[PDB]
Structure formats: structure tokens, C-alpha cells
Amino acid sequence: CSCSPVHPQQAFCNADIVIRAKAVNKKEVDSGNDIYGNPIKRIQYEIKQIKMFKGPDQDIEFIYTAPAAAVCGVSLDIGGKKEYLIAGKAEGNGNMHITLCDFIVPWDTLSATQKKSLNHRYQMGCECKITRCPMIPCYISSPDECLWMDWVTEKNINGHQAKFFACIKRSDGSCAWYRG
Amino acid sequence: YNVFPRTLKWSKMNLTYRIVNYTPDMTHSEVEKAFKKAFKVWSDVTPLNFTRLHDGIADIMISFGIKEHGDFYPFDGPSGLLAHAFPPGPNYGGDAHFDDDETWTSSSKGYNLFLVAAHEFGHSLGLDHSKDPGALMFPIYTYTGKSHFMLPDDDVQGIQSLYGP
Numbered sequence: 001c002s003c004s005p006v007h008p009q010q011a012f013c014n015a016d017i018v019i020r021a022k023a024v025n026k027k028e029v030d031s032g033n034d035i036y037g038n039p040i041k042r043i044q045y046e047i048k049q050i051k052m053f054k055g056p057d058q059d060i061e062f063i064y065t066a067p068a069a070a071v072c073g074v075s076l077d078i079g080g081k082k083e084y085l086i087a088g089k090a091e092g093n094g095n096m097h098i099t100l101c102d103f104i105v106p107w108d109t110l111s112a113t114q115k116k117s118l119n120h121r122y123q124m125g126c127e128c129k130i131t132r133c134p135m136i137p138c139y140i141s142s143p144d145e146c147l148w149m150d151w152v153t154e155k156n157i158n159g160h161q162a163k164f165f166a167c168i169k170r171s172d173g174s175c176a177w178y179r180g
Numbered sequence: 181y182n183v184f185p186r187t188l189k190w191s192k193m194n195l196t197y198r199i200v201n202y203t204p205d206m207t208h209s210e211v212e213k214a215f216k217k218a219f220k221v222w223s224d225v226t227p228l229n230f231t232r233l234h235d236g237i238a239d240i241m242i243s244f245g246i247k248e249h250g251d252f253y254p255f256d257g258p259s260g261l262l263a264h265a266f267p268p269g270p271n272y273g274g275d276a277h278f279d280d281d282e283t284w285t286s287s288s289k290g291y292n293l294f295l296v297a298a299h300e301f302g303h304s305l306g307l308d309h310s311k312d313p314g315a316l317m318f319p320i321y322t323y324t325g326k327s328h329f330m331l332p333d334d335d336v337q338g339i340q341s342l343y344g345p
């Protein structure tokens with residue numbers, strides 16, 4: 001499984017659902033057979049939703065993911081003391097589907113700016129594009145973009161900009177990184 | 181490193197692959213070179229060897245898909261999921277699928293097909309994801325360096341733990 005690197009604001013803006021939650025149980029569920037006759041299973045996580053930052057009013061009680069890492073399956077801690085910031089796809093009322101490409105991190109690893117940004121700052125920035133900078137020199141092609149320089153400046157997707165900045169529209173200019 | 185249940189690895193050292201279809205993003209020659217290079221990363225450090233088949237059945241079936249492409253794991257348009265693959269075994273086993281709603285390149289632009297393929301082929305051979313962002317088997321793509329790809333030690337060590345150097 002190969003995933004695009006994503007800044008938290010992109011993850012927030014692109015996901016159907018963004019919650020803080022704790023997984024309390026895991027169960028395999030039968031979901032038919034593939035074209036070759038192999039049984040298809042989904043892993044079903046029973047969760048407790050702590051808070052929803054974005055999504056349908058009906059609380060998420062279940063999260064499904066693939067059994068295999070290799071087709072982007074996710075493993076969550078089902079001990080019941082480990083909280084996670086889960087962004088992902090909305091299924092039928094009360095159900096949610098996650099892949100490794102979704103933004104999923106232990107709640108406790110989040111910077112204070114990241115936690116707070118989930119309430120309103122990231123939504124403020126959704127109209128801005130956050131653009132990748134795979135290799136220098138990368139340019140600011142358009143006013144509606146911020147350049148995500150974490151990778152080439154330091155070596156971490158969760159760098160300085162991921163932890164402390166949001167890309168939001170300014171008055172005179174359009175978009176720019178903001179630490180607030 | 182991290183490996184899938186060791187018991188189910190490729191029992192034979194000669195493996196075959198076939199490119200089922202081609203992205204229009206690059207020429208056939210370019211696609212072929214990317215995959216050839218990607219397999220070489222692994223064959224250079226183990227007894228495995230790879231042969232490309234023009235037609236017929238191959239162990240590693242490679243194809244480009246857009247959203248629903250035949251399996252239970254649809255792609256999601258541009259960005260997000262870039263590719264996926266299946267561990268050693270029959271049918272799907274060993275196969276790799278690349279999301280053609282990405283722009284695939286032989287450069288730093290879009291997504292570099294060779295790098296993503298080298299990762300996915302790791303799964304085709306039995307490796308799981310590494311927790312080290314510096315390893316090839318890390319699941320989040322990061323455009324590597326400037327020019328000269330070197331399989332990180334951890335990935336070398338992982339694949340050798342399965343097949344020997």
C-alpha cells in the first residue's frame with residue numbers, strides 16, 4: 001500500500017468524517033468471495049466516539065478496514081485506553097471505513113495547534129490548496145496555494161508546517177501559511 | 181523490518197511478471213524500465229530472479245486501475261491511495277495494482293512509478309510495512325533524494341530474512 005503524504009489540514013478537508021475515538025473491540029466479518037473464490041473479510045472495530053469534528057450527526061460506533069496491510073488495512077489498538085484522531089470515509093449511518101492512507105494518529109501525538117485546529121481553523125483553510133514540494137526548487141504557481149516544505153526542509157511529513165501551520169486565505173493575497 | 185507470516189513465501193526462486201496494461205502517462209518502454217528497475221532492487225540482494233512475460237500467466241500480474249478495477253479495493257481518484265499489492269500466493273497473490281488517476285513519472289513530478297513499484301513488489305515478495313519513514317517499505321510516499329536509489333539496510337535485511345542474500 002502506497003499513500004500520498006498529506007498535511008493534517010488536507011486530511012481534515014478531504015475526509016468525510018473526522019473524530020476522536022477509542023477502539024474497544026475487533027471482529028472479523030464475512031463479506032463474500034472474490035472472483036477466484038477467496039473469501040473476503042472485513043475487520044470491524046467497535047469504537048466509542050469521544051468527539052466528532054466533522055461528519056454526520058449519527059455517532060460512529062463501527063469502523064471497517066481491510067485485513068491486509070498490503071491493500072491498505074489498518075490496525076488499531078483495541079485495549080480501550082488508546083485514543084486516536086480518525087479521519088475517514090462515511091458508510092451507512094453509524095459506520096465508517098478507514099485505510100492506511102487516511103489520517104490516523106494517536107491522539108496524544110498531536111501538537112496543541114493540531115488539536116485546536118480541528119475545531120475550526122482547518123475548515124477555514126479548505127478553500128486553499130496545500131501543494132507538495134517533492135524536490136527543490138518547487139514554486140508557488142498560484143495564489144490559492146501554500147507550498148508544503150516540511151519534506152525538503154526537514155525530513156518528516158509531520159514537520160514544522162504540519163504541526164503548527166494552516167494554509168488560509170488572506171485579504172490582499174490569497175493563501176499563505178499561518179501559525180496564529 | 182516487518183514480514184507477513186514467513187511460512188507463506190515464494191517456494192521457487194524464478195518468478196514471472198506480466199504488465200497487463202500501461203498507463204498513458206509514460207511510454208511502454210518507460211513503464212517497462214521502471215518495473216525492471218523495481219524488481220532489480222530485490223533480485224540484487226537475494227536469489228530471486230524475475231522474468232517478464234509478454235502474454236499468458238505470470239506470478240506477478242501488474243495493472244493500472246481507476247477506482248473500481250475488479251477487486252474489493254477500489255482506488256479513490258487523484259492522490260490518497262497510489263497503489264496496493266498482494267502477498268505471495270495463487271491468483272491475486274503477488275499482484276500489484278497502480279491507481280492511474282495519479283500522474284506516473286520517471287521523475288520527481290507526480291508519483292515516481294519506480295519508487296512506488298519497488299515498495300509494492302516488496303509486498304509481492306512477502307514484506308509488510310516498516311515503521312521507519314526512511315525504509316522503502318514505509319507506506320507513505322516521499323520522493324527519494326536526488327538521483328541514485330539505494331535500498332535501505334532495513335529492507336535488505338527484511339527480504340534476506342525471507343529468502344537469504
Ligand SMILES: [Ca+2]
Pocket residue numbers: 238239240241269270271272273274275
Ligand atoms: Ca499472482
Ligand SMILES: [Ca+2]
Pocket residue numbers: 255256257258259260261262279281282
Ligand atoms: Ca489515488
Ligand SMILES: [Zn+2]
Pocket residue numbers: 001002069070299300303309317318319
Ligand atoms: Zn504498502
Ligand SMILES: [Zn+2]
Pocket residue numbers: 245249251253264277
Ligand atoms: Zn486493486
